[PDB]
Amino acid sequence: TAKVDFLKKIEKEIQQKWDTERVFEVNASNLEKQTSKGKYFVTFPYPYMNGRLHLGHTFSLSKCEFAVGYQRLKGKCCLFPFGLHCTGMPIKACADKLKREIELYGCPPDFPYQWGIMKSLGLSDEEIVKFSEAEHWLDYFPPLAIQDLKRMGLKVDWRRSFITTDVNPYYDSFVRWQFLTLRERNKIKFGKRYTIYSPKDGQPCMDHDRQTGEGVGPQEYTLLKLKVLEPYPSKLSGLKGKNIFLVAATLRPETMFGQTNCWVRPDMKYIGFETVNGDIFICTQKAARNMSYQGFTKDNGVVPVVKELMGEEILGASLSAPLTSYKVIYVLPMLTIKEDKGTGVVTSVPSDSPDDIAALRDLKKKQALRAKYGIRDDMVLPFEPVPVIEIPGFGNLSAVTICDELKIQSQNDREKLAEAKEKIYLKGFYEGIMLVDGFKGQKVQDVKKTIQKKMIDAGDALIYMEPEKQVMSRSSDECVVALCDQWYLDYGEENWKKQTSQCLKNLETFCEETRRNFEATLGWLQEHACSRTYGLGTHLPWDEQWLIESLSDSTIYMAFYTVAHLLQGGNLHGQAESPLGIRPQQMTKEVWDYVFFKEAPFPKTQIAKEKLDQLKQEFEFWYPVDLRVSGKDLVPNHLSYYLYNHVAMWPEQSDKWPTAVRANGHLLLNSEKMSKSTGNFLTLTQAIDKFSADGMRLALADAGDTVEDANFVEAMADAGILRLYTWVEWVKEMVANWDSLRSGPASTFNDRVFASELNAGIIKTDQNYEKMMFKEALKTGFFEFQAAKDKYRELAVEGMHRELVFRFIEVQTLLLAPFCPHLCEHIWTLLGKPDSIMNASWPVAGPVNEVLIHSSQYLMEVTHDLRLRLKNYPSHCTIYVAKNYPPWQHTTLSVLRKHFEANNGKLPDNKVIASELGSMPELKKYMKKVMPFVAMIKENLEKMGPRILDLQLEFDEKAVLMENIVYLTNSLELEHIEVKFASEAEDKIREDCCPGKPLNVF
């Protein structure tokens, strides 16, 4: 317990040191004069401030944190800036939701939550009243997140942090210049388009202000109009005189030539309302909402309800359907009707829809179902399936044949209906052929749109856009697809999309699945609505009313990082003075152009040339973005617009486009989802309070480095705390007893073994750090490192050589630095080292000899087997080692060598090997042992390479054994071990013992 407290004390002291020394503040004015090794620009997409920062954000930023901790030791000058996102509606949604139940009820509010979560954060009762305005959120949460980050100890130049709404005037001017240049180059466009839309919010709902289906778009439906013919059913008598239409949703208009009736749900509530032209549409509630927002009614979003009813009161109504062969069809019931899709009204195409003919047969069999709703004989019997589309494998009546073949007798046969619908699902999309006149012998793929247009021009069909899946907004409002006018980014331009495809070709994605997602979201993208009305951010500069959504004012902000320290200089809101003395309003479009475009002319500005040149130098030095780390959730939306805007703003300078992007999965805590509902959740401050942020970073580096979800194990973090405490106390012990170690030459066998192991570990760690596999880098550089250390301590009977010990300590403190830099800086100061550890470089690795590491692993295996066999049955041990392989083993290994040499290293199957070795007489007595032997061989062939195929070992087995017999006798608690050369041994040993696998008897 006190170990974590000691760690936190060290962290706070070293953070005070890092702040007072200002070691992480980098400036292009100083670093461009010393061309050290090149720049390294990492970026973390700023998170939203609608709450404290949790462990997922920390895991996502740990990637670039460790990356800069590694690259700064390799000589590259690192830039890790960090912004803070406050654009967007979520803040406002939560706050006004709070006001809703704060003023319609009391304080505390009476029930039968949100205020509960706020008090769970622990604010004072008289302080949540101050949370009505978002101004207090932006004055409160950015400082707290910054404090949490500084307590974590990130290598950030904090003078470059800022806020993203109009509260910050400098970022506001930056966004204004961005959008002015974008609309200047025809990248923005005003127009009336379809989009997901939140009625309660009154604006298009994009991916970052939703609550379900974070990538759902609109989906098109052909909406057929069916004239309700007289005699009107009873419940409609009040609306006599006007036109009454049943609106039915479909995606297969070409099948409407074979309509027989109209399926409705008898126990669902339908609503009939008035359209814009005075007619009456009958649909469901949400269908009416969607239609109203798609300009179907007189007023946008207004549904004048003229009658509410049930499906039972609708059955038997005569209908005039479009394109049907029957001049009169009827309204029939259907019980298997989903209450979410479409209008609650489906078409009856029994020739190519299986559920339709199923229901038709259920009605046609008995008087029970046919009379079950007043459906007289005339509404079921004469309605036969109408052959309209011929699928070659089934005939003119496809669904009929496939259902009669799969032996289905229940419209409610969900398994069999699913089967039958799957069988001809797509074979009617291509292989289907029209049969009606005008289209006799047409590919249905080439006529469905023309038939849709034919119905629309006839005034019998319309377009209905619906959310492909149910979408909830930030305001708990069910989104609908609305046709609204807005300013949108035309991400569908051919030239722009092709240029971004070239950028993706040049972009470095760390896996192929990331590039797959990028190509898919590039092919899927189209006009994207960037205009909002409710929320925060920056207004459109030419249209002061339209606000900019969070996913559009956050595309090229990384250029603002390069000058945030000289424009507002640390102050988040930009209210204070400018360190360069540049007024907030003084930044004009041409000023930004000169700062960010290379060939831009110096504009007419009262700003002196020195400051503009300094900003241009900063930008032209740090850019482009070398790396952007994020979770894979921002792949389809954020990083796509990121590359798009980087291509659009600099269409001539590909050298300034993003260099690389790294995607990680979402974080799991104790193998469980991080959710406030399950009690398995850790904010950054709680995680630091519990796991000594150094150690939290350690466990995060071990959490994972793949696209799959990483796992944060608390027990692993505690184990890391214990290991670090043992390491620190061991280093203290060594500092104490330096005078109690061996001096002189590092010439002992174990000294060489440990030194080569250390150098190999250095190499493995560097190679894992370049590839950003932080889990594997930790495995090679900390765990295996400590293992080699403890092995060398165990085997060094003549005392550990001080030079090797402290070279190891130095190298370990270096390799662990990017993970737990507080403890590493503490140890670096404990060594009496003059400067801070952030100035150190990469440790140079000496020569590596594979053969001595192989002999060390050999001794390890020998010790393991010795402790195994000591279990049963002493004082003396006797070991036997074979020079050459026994004749049968030598022959089998020669055969395996031939089979390896002949075919580029592919040993045949066990079958061929057993067959050919049964074809050798010299193995007749040993065919029982031959196949096991070979088997074992194969294992090691995949375990430690082909070196086991050599007819003789790379080292002296007997001398290697004899260089550590002392440790073996001391650990095995014996009295003597005689090593004999296996030829003096008896028959069994001399016959079965092979080189590399010695035997022994006590």
Ligand SMILES: CC(C)C[C@H](N)C(=O)NS(=O)(=O)OC[C@H]1O[C@@H](n2cnc3c(N)ncnc32)[C@H](O)[C@@H]1O
């Ligand atoms: C520039 C702008 C358009 C970005 C925008 N401000 C934004 O996305 N803000 S945010 O508050 O949710 O995302 C912050 C980052 O943290 C990662 N992350 C979030 N949650 C988790 C989690 N549970 N587990 C793992 N990672 C998580 C996520 O990928 C994201 O990159």
Ligand SMILES: CC(C)C[C@H](N)C(=O)O
């Ligand atoms: C495509 C679906 C919405 C409708 C289907 N073709 C049917 O007749 O039931």
